[PDB]
Design a protein around this motif. Structure first.
Motif, PDB file in Angstrom:
ATOM      1  N   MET C  53      -2.657  -6.100  -2.271  1.00 49.09           N
ATOM      2  CA  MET C  53      -1.518  -5.748  -1.429  1.00 49.09           C
ATOM      3  C   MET C  53      -1.785  -4.394  -0.791  1.00 49.09           C
ATOM      4  O   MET C  53      -2.461  -3.552  -1.384  1.00 49.09           O
ATOM      5  N   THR C 185      10.962 -15.128  -1.733  1.00 47.16           N
ATOM      6  CA  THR C 185      10.682 -16.553  -1.490  1.00 47.16           C
ATOM      7  C   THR C 185      11.764 -17.442  -2.095  1.00 47.16           C
ATOM      8  O   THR C 185      12.239 -18.383  -1.462  1.00 47.16           O
ATOM      9  N   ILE C 219       5.505  -9.574 -13.884  1.00 52.05           N
ATOM     10  CA  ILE C 219       5.326  -8.785 -15.103  1.00 52.05           C
ATOM     11  C   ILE C 219       5.955  -7.408 -14.941  1.00 52.05           C
ATOM     12  O   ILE C 219       5.585  -6.641 -14.053  1.00 52.05           O
ATOM     13  N   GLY C 239       1.369  -6.083  -9.423  1.00 52.27           N
ATOM     14  CA  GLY C 239       1.655  -5.321  -8.222  1.00 52.27           C
ATOM     15  C   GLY C 239       2.501  -4.107  -8.561  1.00 52.27           C
ATOM     16  O   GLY C 239       2.008  -2.984  -8.545  1.00 52.27           O
ATOM     17  N   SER C 240       3.770  -4.341  -8.900  1.00 53.57           N
ATOM     18  CA  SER C 240       4.715  -3.256  -9.178  1.00 53.57           C
ATOM     19  C   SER C 240       4.259  -2.280 -10.260  1.00 53.57           C
ATOM     20  O   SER C 240       4.490  -1.084 -10.149  1.00 53.57           O
ATOM     21  N   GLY C 265       6.412  -6.138  -0.275  1.00 56.57           N
ATOM     22  CA  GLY C 265       5.820  -7.462  -0.256  1.00 56.57           C
ATOM     23  C   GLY C 265       4.867  -7.562   0.924  1.00 56.57           C
ATOM     24  O   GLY C 265       5.063  -6.908   1.948  1.00 56.57           O
ATOM     25  N   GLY C 267       4.750 -10.080   2.487  1.00 53.26           N
ATOM     26  CA  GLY C 267       5.574 -10.908   3.347  1.00 53.26           C
ATOM     27  C   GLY C 267       6.784 -10.173   3.895  1.00 53.26           C
ATOM     28  O   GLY C 267       7.657 -10.791   4.497  1.00 53.26           O
ATOM     29  N   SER C 268       6.833  -8.856   3.687  1.00 56.14           N
ATOM     30  CA  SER C 268       7.889  -8.019   4.250  1.00 56.14           C
ATOM     31  C   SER C 268       7.625  -7.753   5.727  1.00 56.14           C
ATOM     32  O   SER C 268       6.495  -7.919   6.196  1.00 56.14           O
ATOM     33  N   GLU C 280       9.483 -12.931   3.546  1.00 59.18           N
ATOM     34  CA  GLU C 280       9.634 -13.453   2.185  1.00 59.18           C
ATOM     35  C   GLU C 280       9.383 -12.368   1.140  1.00 59.18           C
ATOM     36  O   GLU C 280       9.112 -12.651  -0.043  1.00 59.18           O
TER      37      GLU C 280
HETATM   38  O1  LIG Z   1       6.099 -10.588   0.201  1.00 56.24           O
HETATM   39  C1  LIG Z   1       5.733 -11.366  -0.683  1.00 56.24           C
HETATM   40  N1  LIG Z   1       6.534 -12.436  -0.984  1.00 56.24           N
HETATM   41  C2  LIG Z   1       6.353 -13.142  -2.158  1.00 56.24           C
HETATM   42  N2  LIG Z   1       5.383 -12.770  -3.056  1.00 56.24           N
HETATM   43  C3  LIG Z   1       4.584 -11.725  -2.767  1.00 56.24           C
HETATM   44  C4  LIG Z   1       4.746 -11.002  -1.595  1.00 56.24           C
HETATM   45  N3  LIG Z   1       3.815 -10.031  -1.591  1.00 56.24           N
HETATM   46  C5  LIG Z   1       3.083 -10.105  -2.730  1.00 56.24           C
HETATM   47  N4  LIG Z   1       3.551 -11.165  -3.464  1.00 56.24           N
HETATM   48  C6  LIG Z   1       3.115 -11.638  -4.791  1.00 56.24           C
HETATM   49  O2  LIG Z   1       3.702 -10.803  -5.773  1.00 56.24           O
HETATM   50  C7  LIG Z   1       2.677 -10.293  -6.657  1.00 56.24           C
HETATM   51  C8  LIG Z   1       3.116  -8.951  -7.206  1.00 56.24           C
HETATM   52  O3  LIG Z   1       4.186  -9.113  -8.138  1.00 56.24           O
HETATM   53  P1  LIG Z   1       4.677  -7.931  -9.085  1.00 56.24           P
HETATM   54  O4  LIG Z   1       3.581  -7.603 -10.081  1.00 56.24           O
HETATM   55  O5  LIG Z   1       5.851  -8.503  -9.822  1.00 56.24           O
HETATM   56  O6  LIG Z   1       5.166  -6.770  -8.253  1.00 56.24           O
HETATM   57  C9  LIG Z   1       1.422 -10.308  -5.791  1.00 56.24           C
HETATM   58  O7  LIG Z   1       0.219 -10.269  -6.544  1.00 56.24           O
HETATM   59  C10 LIG Z   1       1.594 -11.589  -4.972  1.00 56.24           C
HETATM   60  O8  LIG Z   1       1.211 -12.743  -5.713  1.00 56.24           O
END
Ligand SMILES: O=c1[nH]cnc2c1ncn2[C@@H]1O[C@H](COP(=O)(O)O)[C@@H](O)[C@H]1O
Ligand SMILES: C[C@@H](Oc1cc(=O)[nH]c2ccccc12)c1cn(-c2ccc(Cl)cc2)nn1
Ligand SMILES: C[C@@H](Oc1cc(=O)[nH]c2ccccc12)c1cn(-c2ccc(Cl)cc2)nn1
Ligand SMILES: C[C@@H](Oc1cc(=O)[nH]c2ccccc12)c1cn(-c2ccc(Cl)cc2)nn1
Ligand SMILES: C[C@@H](Oc1cc(=O)[nH]c2ccccc12)c1cn(-c2ccc(Cl)cc2)nn1
Ligand SMILES: O=c1[nH]cnc2c1ncn2[C@@H]1O[C@H](COP(=O)(O)O)[C@@H](O)[C@H]1O
Ligand SMILES: O=c1[nH]cnc2c1ncn2[C@@H]1O[C@H](COP(=O)(O)O)[C@@H](O)[C@H]1O
Ligand SMILES: O=c1[nH]cnc2c1ncn2[C@@H]1O[C@H](COP(=O)(O)O)[C@@H](O)[C@H]1O
Lengths: 349, 349, 349, 349
Positions: C53, C185, C219, C239-240, C265, C267-268, C280
């Motif tokens: 990302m 999404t 996670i 990601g986060s 995201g 998808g932002s 999304e």
């Molecule tokens: O804008 C988006 N829409 C939906 N899923 C996303 C988007 N951008 C990234 N992701 C997914 O969300 C994951 C990150 O999730 P996190 O660890 O919960 O923040 C990424 O590795 C992608 O699989």
């Protein structure tokens, strides 16, 4: 043994777990009957009883309740003489119906004697735990002395308890352990039965004897009352929904420009004043609601709508035929106003 | 293989998932017995133990707990000499009962030797993960050297772990992985068992050997204690409910005119001070509660009410016979005071 | 027909629905192995990948991730030349492992050609909906041109999709539709699969081919990672939890005396900049966390504890043998610190 | 009897209880068809209808809705002459499609006569409780006089009600009892059916006759619309999501520098103005959203994404083939952005 294995088998539902399913109807809300017969000598035009609590029902409430077609239970936190006087006050106000609460004590028969002399229509043997030998013995004793007296006994939450009170001679059974708005029994003692299940289980038993049950406690909105009746109760008993109307006992108190009345559990510190038992209720305040009539009109109006939706031309149809559908917390969230900023409070929300 | 398929089959319940079902009773709360026998040499008049934590139990707490009829576990975050001295302090205060916590370390036997010389009544082999070979080996070792010593071992959350500790020689098993108020094990490691299920599963096994279990952690209200005992525990262990009473270690600290005491996980940064393991507990503050006696009276009072409701004249009846009913989040909301603005805090809410 | 009847049959679980059950252990957290093999040419010392990302991984993050034993995926929101340069930057930093994201576009092969010339270790064919013919065709095409190239393809959330990507030639499958912290999404499109179920279903299929899956998204705590691996994933993607560390791209911004970094995201609106598709994902900010090392040490520490509790001496044991227990929302509330006012924030909470 | 036993058997799901499962797709969102056929003479290019409410649809909204490919229902809180004039206004704006709401009243046929003269495309017999003899009789009467008129009848929430309206002559059935954002039916009357279950049950019946259903109420996000269509509806009806766009009736009002419009239940005190029935809706305000076009583009965009994910090249595929997976409240929490502080509001969140 067997009891060890069954420890976690049962499941219980409360008001917010279900909705009533709409059915074929040829009745409008204004056309339905909300009358109910508790016994040959106790017939109510609306299926509502005000709680026997020292912040809900004394003579003024009982008079107003009876005029609306319901029933008030005069609470027991007063002398025998005072309670008999309150009952008499209701009777002389046009021969209206009135009930009176009595505890399981040595002086219970003395109190009952005076209430009967005052022409009370029903005695409520009102106890925290109705399924106890003390209660059963007291019911048998009262029934033996007063064969024609309406005896409402409770509270209970199971079929077995219901059977026990009916066999002891109670002709109305009051249902509810732990659902009250001001109740802490569930937190303090860890005991209770989700109220819709309690009502249904108890009604299932009482039905077998032609005995009505009262759904007592936990009703927060008019729709909860519809649900309680549809779960099998003939009538409901309300505390919080009647606390704060003009006719309830206690003064209206003003704080930061708003009118409140005190509402408290009978098991709260203050009420019990008026080793040793720990409290099982709290003391609080409720907004002043104005006259009882306005609140009853909203309650009965809600019931009328619910019955119309269920196609219930009368309460017997509702008890016998209405069906529920179970929902999740998400279901509940859909079932209240959502995602809109309410600008005016409604008379029924 | 088989293990792959079973990954998501099990379900677990915690305190807020259930209520105890009222049953036929001829016992009043003041008449019930709350005595419990953990072993021939460890009999408690009330089924409460204070946690072996450095913000809960040193000698003053253990003395107060024992006088109330319970038991205090002196924590292990001090030198061997200091702990033995604390135990001795309790014993000379009238020969009161006292327990002491010991970790699985090389110096564990040396520590145990001194505690036994100080006349300790029970050793708690206290570990994050009781179902480990290190713990089992330590229990076997202690039991071999001290055939008559009360050995409480834990913590565990499964029947298998329970079996393993009993076979190794533990005569009391302590149950609870992840339920503690100050615990972050579930968040950090992803591990735990909802506490009521843990207690029931472990009790099911321990029962087979005539061995008692201690329900340790997660109890927030007196009713949770009733539920834990009814799920099969002989006694409960409390941390948060005792933190903040006058007899707990630590100073009373004042912030914006209110009195607080520190309460922290033994797995918190600060406690562990007094690659490398990440913390599994947090540090916080609890309101000052005054003397231990007032808190114990409320707890035992709640238990007495719960037993009365269940018709349990003693704790054995409760463990063997009491039944639960499962509820949803809606059930929980009904089971606390609702829709009323509480104006006075109750001694038990 | 049959499909009409099956519409509501399936059920799915996410991280907060379950806990891992403690099992017999003779391993301490510091002794467990957290190594994982994704392919013959892609072996990780810790089972963590940073998301592809534009607010998580460019060369500095990928370098730091690789040094910790993990893997960084260089994001695709840059020119082909820029991405190849970033990959090269990682490789020259000691031959560390690095991955790179590629979309399904006409110029995908051109982009892949340059990344392969730059010695990339894995290509991530990264798409919103992996179970599409476009993705399958692209995988087949890449695999045909590059027989030895590690191809990670996703995202998917079902066994069937998993089977389809493996048959097309993907040697790692990335799992997760809708669980991301910044994801909308599920709200916008109404589509997703609770992440633990997605991982388990996809792993069940991938296992049959000896193919690993990556648990991507959702996670929030180190324990969620333990749960994802125990549900069958070889590794997780975050990601986060990595946004906001010093090595992530983007400037540290100061608002009211606190340091934040942007996390959004892919998808932002903003990321898609760098009829037509509606967004999304959302744009937000996360607290600055300091160096990546400190965050990874807490994550791996949590995993080590979880493995110790499960008696998992390595990740294969965890995937194959660890068992879960399902809980309610009440279970969840017990599973976080409760009824205590936290005074210090922990490094892992 | 049998009805007593079945009281609590049924279970119902709403939007937030489920997600759509991604499936094999070779269609991009921009390529899918969102056209739908309600009857030979009522074909919509997008599956959206604006509610017949006095704060949602008069002529300007209906014109804008029709131009977008949808349909507006002109509300009935106006004189017969006014409503016919509004319909005529839409028809002269290029022969666009328009519907009109009519209640079950003595003057219903007179109102319908005028609307038919004005060239209305569909009449909505719009009632609180569609499964009533009054409604059935009115449908039969209208159908007999107007054999070719599109008759949308509702609202209902069960298969039986659906069957009854179709047999009476309705050619479209409108589904939804209690899900509305401004609705208090569930609280006041205790009646309703979780909306996804209502749609599915009603569609199951309507399918047997080749009759379409409209999913009316409860839709809060574009994904809820995808779910409603996938549960079997041909189209959805929206109130809250259209309240506040420029073309809705009512003035834009300014409070503390923000623009709001009034949105209220047709069963609210104010709307009913424009014993006696108690209100079943509330009055509120919604943020001004700007032109209808911008809101419709976001809605349809969300649907396109959902269809792409499901591999649905058209709505018939979605209704017939799309599968759901059930989730808990934890599932829901994962399914919205979490643990990140949103800094910009998205056009679709
Ligand atoms: O804008 C988006 N829409 C939906 N899923 C996303 C988007 N951008 C990234 N992701 C997914 O969300 C994951 C990150 O999730 P996190 O660890 O919960 O923040 C990424 O590795 C992608 O699989
Ligand atoms: C603390 C007090 O609370 C109540 C006092 C009261 O007047 N009414 C109640 C109704 C429901 C629940 C509690 C009360 C009280 C509790 N109990 C009580 C509790 C359990 C048993 Cl078995 C027997 C009695 N007896 N009085
Ligand atoms: C971080 C620290 O936490 C605790 C330290 C402690 O004194 N008591 C605890 C009780 C319950 C949970 C955690 C602790 C700790 C965790 N562990 C630990 C965790 C897992 C295993 Cl297998 C073995 C040990 N050993 N010490
Ligand atoms: C709006 C945008 O969102 C994303 C853009 C992106 O780079 N990554 C994502 C990962 C997961 C979810 C969404 C995105 C996007 C959505 N889609 C998309 C949605 C559905 C299908 Cl069938 C095909 C494509 N293609 N791009
Ligand atoms: C109070 C008022 O509410 C509405 C008024 C209205 O115009 N539309 C509604 C749509 C759904 C729910 C309620 C309303 C109303 C309620 N009812 C009503 C309720 C039940 C029956 Cl059986 C018959 C009619 N008839 N009008
Ligand atoms: O203090 C108490 N503890 C528990 N229940 C109580 C107490 N006082 C009254 N009740 C019950 O609660 C009912 C009122 O419930 P409400 O209508 O929800 O406010 C009464 O009719 C009693 O059955
Ligand atoms: O830091 C820790 N992490 C996890 N559990 C702990 C920690 N410290 C103490 N405990 C457990 O938590 C119990 C106290 O729980 P409480 O009564 O809910 O506050 C103790 O008796 C221990 O079993
Ligand atoms: O006052 C009312 N009470 C109950 N339902 C209503 C009322 N007014 C409108 N509705 C229904 O609620 C729908 C709007 O729901 P919304 O899209 O969630 O805001 C309308 O199309 C009607 O079916």
């Amino acid at each position: 043994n067997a009891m060890w294995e069954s420890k976690f088998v049962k499941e219980g539902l409360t008001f917010d777990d279900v909705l009533l399913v709409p059915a074929k109807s040829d009745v409008l809300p204004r056309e339905v009957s909300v009358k109910t017969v508790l016994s040959e000598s106790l017939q109510l035009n609306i299926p509502l009883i005000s709680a026997g609590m020292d912040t809900v029902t004394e003579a003024d409430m009982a008079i107003a309740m009876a005029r609306q077609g319901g029933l008030g239970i005069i609470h027991k936190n007063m002398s025998i003489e005072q309670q008999a006087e309150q009952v008499d006050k209701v009777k002389r106000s046009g021969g209206l119906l009135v009930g009176a609460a009595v505890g399981v004590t040595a002086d219970a028969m003395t109190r009952i004697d005076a209430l009967v002399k005052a022409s009370v229509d029903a005695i409520v043997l009102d106890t925290a735990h109705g399924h106890s030998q003390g209660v059963i013995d007291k019911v048998k004793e009262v029934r033996a002395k007063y064969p024609s007296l309406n005896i409402i006994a409770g509270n209970v939450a199971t079929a077995e308890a219901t059977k026990a009170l009916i066999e002891a001679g109670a002709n109305v059974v009051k249902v509810g352990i732990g659902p009250g708005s001001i109740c802490t029994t569930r937190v303090v003692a860890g005991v209770g039965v989700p109220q819709l299940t309690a009502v249904y289980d108890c009604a299932t038993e009482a039905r077998k004897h032609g005995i009505p049950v009262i759904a007592d406690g936990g009703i927060k909105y008019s729709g909860d009352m519809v649900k309680a009746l549809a779960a099998g109760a003939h009538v409901v008993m309300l505390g919080s929904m009647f606390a704060g109307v003009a006719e309830s006992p206690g003064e209206t108190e003003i704080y930061q420009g708003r009118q409140f009345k005190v509402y408290r559990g009978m098991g709260s510190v203050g009420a019990m004043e008026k080793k040793k038992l720990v409290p099982e209720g709290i003391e609080g305040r409720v907004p002043y609601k104005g006259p009882l009539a306005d609140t009853v009109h909203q309650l009965v109006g809600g019931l009328r709508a619910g019955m119309g939706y269920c196609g219930a031309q009368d309460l017997e149809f509702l008890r016998e035929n209405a069906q529920f559908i179970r929902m999740s917390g998400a279901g509940l969230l859909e079932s209240h106003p959502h995602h809109v900023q309410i600008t005016k409070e409604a008379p029924n929300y």
